[PDB]
């Protein structure tokens with residue numbers, strides 16, 4: 001028992017982290033096979049970031065200008081190319097530690113682990129969610145760009161995120177591994193509206209099931225609700241509308257505990273309306289939305 | 305910016321995880337050099353756990369009875385010995401992936417990362433603290449015993465914890481790497497009093513400094529306090545008494561923000577007395593005590 005904001009073991013991703021330097025700009029790169037993937041803003045100076053013409057900036061760069069270092073060894077760059085907001089530096093050596101991998105585009109509300117890196121060296125790993133407004137509430141300092149987000153299915157690492165920018169609001173934005181931004185962000189130092197965020201309802205419910213599994217049962221009540229009634233409360237509290245697909249996704253957790261999905265929705269409704277009255281659920285004094293139903297089943301079953 | 309419950313990258317510890325089986329009991333082992341360290345209860349059956357005589361139980365076991373497997377390869381056991389509550393199985397092969405390491409005994413209030421393992425395979429990593437009553441609030445299922453806790457100083461892994469037991473209360477207990485239990489626990493399936501826990505005051509203050517660094521400043525007030533006055537409030541709320549060593553440990557954070565340690569104690573006092581009035585600090589609706597002043601400086605500076 002016990003429930004933690006657990007991250008995937010970062011070992012398979014630690015072996016891919018390299019440092020990429022171009023001019024006076026240094027950030028992190030991801031070495032898979034004979035390709036190093038890094039944010040394209042590695043070619044910009046601090047001044048360039050205000051309004052960069054990346055096509056023009058890259059035109060001034062050659063293979064020898066991209067210095068790629070893995071630990072203490074230099075990688076020879078035999079080709080560079082820009083795909084959306086990332087740079088792909090083809091190196092002459094395939095990474096001997098390349099794990100099985102995929103590049104995936106996660107959906108908003110999905111979770112992933114981030115291995116925060118500085119100068120190609122990993123500093124820590126943490127679990128977080130893609131917010132419904134396509135931002136992440138990470139912990140990133142200058143030089144952390146190129147740090148990646150991922151999920152792990154036994155031996156296959158599914159890379160979903162690459163860190164690029166911190167918005168003036170202190171929240172973070174990045175791309176999938178093909179350089180496409182999650183959300184409406186552009187890689188320019190300008191004010192960018194993140195948009196209204198909502199709470200991931202399916203995730204809060206999944207975490208309520210985890211609390212029941214792990215002993216916290218005080219929030220369970222003698223009530224039930226319908227999707228339409230629950231959704232009226234969800235709108236009032238800026239929670240994502242719950243659909244039948246969210247209910248179906250909660251199926252196994254509903255089976256485990258025997259608490260019908262709509263009955264748990266009625267528990268969430270009373271918590272939204274009445275608060276927690278100074279009590280905790282799984283050590284939290286708020287309603288946690290960074291655990292998916294998949295995460296909850298995985299953590300409570302033991303999936304390695 | 306941003307502040308997360310970040311764990312150390314688990315890669316150097318993933319390479320040490322093995323599966324140890326004895327009879328019908330399987331748990332996790334830690335392979336460093338030519339020694340595999342695992343909880344001594346691997347020799348017990350479910351019945352033995354009620355009142356085990358480990359000296360007698362081990363007398364029935366030989367080197368060939370301990371099956372040690374790393375991934376898909378079998379390790380040859382050339383010697384076994386019991387040190388306190390751990391077993392040391394000498395193997396004929398040194399682990400090719402042994403990192404630089406130390407065995408340390410952490411102090412209550414200190415933090416560490418845990419790589420939860422099942423059948424010698426890592427499932428996830430999470431950051432947690434040694435509670436003042438020498439328990440940990442982990443996330444551990446059956447078969448997770450032998451999972452280790454650690455800290456990492458550049459390339460040196462300092463192993464501080466090995467998981468052994470889940471108390472009826474749902475909290476967890478374990479040993480240092482020399483098999484000594486943290487706290488008064490014995491490795492028997494009997495009711496064991498965990499003892500009164502307190503909140504780690506130096507850690508809450510450190511996290512208040514992190515919130516100031518990262519933007520949350522609403523809890524700052526026009527007040528100051530003394531150690532004696534603050535400690536009277538600390539006792540009333542079951543918080544650890546703050547000493548001058550705790551103040552000195554908070555020195556660098558006090559310098560960074562320019563908020564005197566006693567001024568921050570006065571902010572904590574008003575939060576204890578008035579609550580948070582439905583507001584959050586670093587995304588939490590309670591007072592977080594699982595970040596040490598060292599953790600806060602490390603995360604806010606970028607230490608790799």
Ligand SMILES: C[C@@H]1COc2ccc(Cl)cc2[C@@H]1C(=O)Nc1cncc2ccccc12
Nearest residue numbers: 041049140141142164165166187188189305
């Ligand atoms: C500094 C500029 C601002 O404008 C843009 C604009 C676009 C892009 Cl893709 C990057 C940046 C840079 C940035 O946000 N980098 C960072 C990313 N993460 C954490 C950071 C912590 C502190 C300092 C910078 C961080």
Ligand SMILES: C[C@@H]1COc2ccc(Cl)cc2[C@@H]1C(=O)Nc1cncc2ccccc12
Nearest residue numbers: 001345353444445446468469470491492493
């Ligand atoms: C089950 C017995 C109980 O008595 C003792 C007594 C002493 C010892 Cl050192 C181990 C155990 C075992 C135990 O707690 N193991 C576990 C440790 N962690 C998580 C667990 C989740 C579920 C089931 C067991 C877990």
